[PDB]
Write a protein that binds this ligand. Structure first.
Ligand SMILES: *[B]([O])([O])[C]([C]N1[C]=C(C([O])=O)N=N1)[N]C(=O)[C]SC1=NN=C([N])S1
Length: 360
């Protein structure tokens, strides 16, 4: 026989470890949770110049996986009566009243269906007034609610409206409310100086050490969260077992599991991307295709409400890669964290092979 932990370690060795040499990745953390049992696998260095090994205290930048905490915070404020998904941003940011952006509702902002919001804020938009001027000068292009265009400013305005409804800055909404409620003790929007020695360097395509740039404050809901592998395994555990939490946090997590519309085989939930399970590999790869990620796509109402579902989300900054995935019916999830970007298809393919080969 071979113990289950050695079986998972071998599968991660055969599928994820080759990616380090293939893409010259300094460090990697891979974690699997199955039936409430966590398995952690660390590779390489969190800092090349310091020869510091990746370990359970290593803090990675989550990139777009931050959007799952913004969605959770949004579901929390919705179930606590602070917002309604039918509300518009001008209701909470009063300066946006009687402006074109005030016709899009909060759910449409969180699911990227405003009809005229690109992937990124403009480069010059950085200060608080510049973000307000951007949304004030916003004008519609496509019919509101009909086309999904993956957008950081879109969910950034949603996260900003969520924070205003709780009378707290967004970084406090996560670090004072959502992170403590989920048991995450090493997840940050702003890493304190006492934890900087655990903050890994990220590495660009020239393997130069880099870290994320503090852009507009309203970009943190889009890609500004940093966490460790044990905290992300706890976060996957929360999505698998929402009953571990009081009602409003439990309903917040379930809110992020409810698909809102379809784009081909992809269900757009709150933050999470949802799929019928079992999913083909090409279904999961399609979700990160240039056509889905970079272009506007007409949305369709959900036809098949999936009874058996699975969810995932890719995330990247300039020097980090992330991938999270879980399947509720199999009580299993996976997290991948790297301090260098690797193609999204390689993260999806490697996790697909690991999860399907793990004996249930
Ligand atoms: B998110 O990860 O999806 C989002 C979009 N994205 C994906 C990728 C990729 O596949 O490599 N790159 N961006 N991530 C971001 O928007 C990161 S924005 C940053 N601004 N400054 C930095 N140093 S990272």
């Amino acid at each position: 026989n071979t113990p289950k932990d050695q079986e998972i370690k071998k599968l991660v060795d055969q599928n994820f470890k080759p990616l380090l040499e293939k893409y010259d990745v300094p460090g990697m953390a891979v974690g699997v949770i199955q039936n409430n049992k966590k398995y952690e696998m660390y590779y390489g260095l969190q800092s090349v110049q310091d020869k510091k090994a990746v370990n359970s205290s290593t803090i990675f930048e989550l990139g777009s996986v931050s959007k799952l905490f913004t969605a959770t915070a949004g579901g929390y404020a919705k179930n606590k009566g602070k917002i309604s998904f039918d509300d518009t941003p001008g209701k909470y940011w009063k300066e946006l009243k009687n402006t074109p952006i005030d016709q899009v509702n909060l759910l449409q902002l969180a699911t990227y269906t405003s009809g005229n919001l690109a992937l990124q804020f403009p480069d010059e938009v950085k200060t608080d007034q510049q973000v307000l001027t951007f949304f004030k000068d916003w004008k519609p292009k496509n019919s509101i609610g009909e086309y999904r265009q993956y957008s950081n400013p879109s969910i950034g305005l949603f996260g900003k409206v969520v924070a205003l409804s709780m009378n707290k800055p967004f970084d406090q909404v996560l670090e004072k409310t959502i992170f403590p409620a989920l048991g995450l003790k090493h997840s940050y929007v702003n890493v304190p100086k006492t934890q900087m020695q655990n903050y890994a360097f990220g590495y660009n395509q020239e393997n130069q050490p880099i870290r994320v740039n503090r852009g507009p404050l309203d970009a943190a809901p889009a890609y500004g969260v940093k966490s460790t592998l044990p905290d992300m395994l706890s976060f996957i555990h929360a999505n698998l077992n929402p009953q571990k939490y009081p009602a409003d946090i439990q309903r917040a997590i379930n809110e992020t599991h409810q698909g809102r519309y379809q784009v081909n085989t992809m269900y757009q939930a709150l933050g999470w991307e949802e799929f019928s399970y079992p999913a083909t590999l090409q279904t999961l790869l399609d979700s990160n295709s240039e056509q889905i990620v970079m272009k506007p796509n007409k949305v369709t109402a959900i036809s098949k409400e999936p009874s058996v579902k699975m969810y995932h989300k890719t995330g990247s900054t300039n020097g980090f890669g992330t991938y999270v995935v879980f399947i509720p019916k199999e009580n299993i999830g996976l997290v991948m964290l790297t301090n260098k970007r690797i193609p999204n298809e390689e993260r999806i393919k490697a996790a697909y092979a690991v999860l399907n080969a793990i004996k249930k």
